[PDB]
Amino acid sequence: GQRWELALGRFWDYLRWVQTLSEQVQEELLSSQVTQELRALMDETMKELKAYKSELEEQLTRARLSKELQAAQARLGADMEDVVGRLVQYRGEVQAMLGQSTEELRVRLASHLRKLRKRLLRDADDLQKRLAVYQ
Numbered sequence: 001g002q003r004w005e006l007a008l009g010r011f012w013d014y015l016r017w018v019q020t021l022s023e024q025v026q027e028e029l030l031s032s033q034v035t036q037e038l039r040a041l042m043d044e045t046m047k048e049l050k051a052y053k054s055e056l057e058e059q060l061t062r063a064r065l066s067k068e069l070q071a072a073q074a075r076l077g078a079d080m081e082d083v084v085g086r087l088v089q090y091r092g093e094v095q096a097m098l099g100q101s102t103e104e105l106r107v108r109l110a111s112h113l114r115k116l117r118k119r120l121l122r123d124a125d126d127l128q129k130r131l132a133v134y135q
Ligand code: NA
Pocket: 012, 013, 016
């Protein structure tokens, strides 16, 4: 129930919706709305994570653990940036189609998103584990 976990949960719920590639998702993927909204949720998650670590350091080998926690935090942020970037890519590939069917592009986006989401989830679990043993 930590603040950064709730923020990550909002990013995660939003991305679970994007995965469906429903009509309204597809509409908002060709505007900047999905990637703008996900970036805001990403930034919030990272901000709350930074503040949580800072407060944990008040209730605490340490050097190694602190560097490993930094690396796990950076992985989470890179994962979220990779998701946003893949969705920016999709918008460009649609435009290149010049009005032609995007069904194949959507099948391919859906399968790639599943794998990016798998990576984000496993990195979030690893980060949560390191935060629990840091404290
Ligand atoms: Na969900």
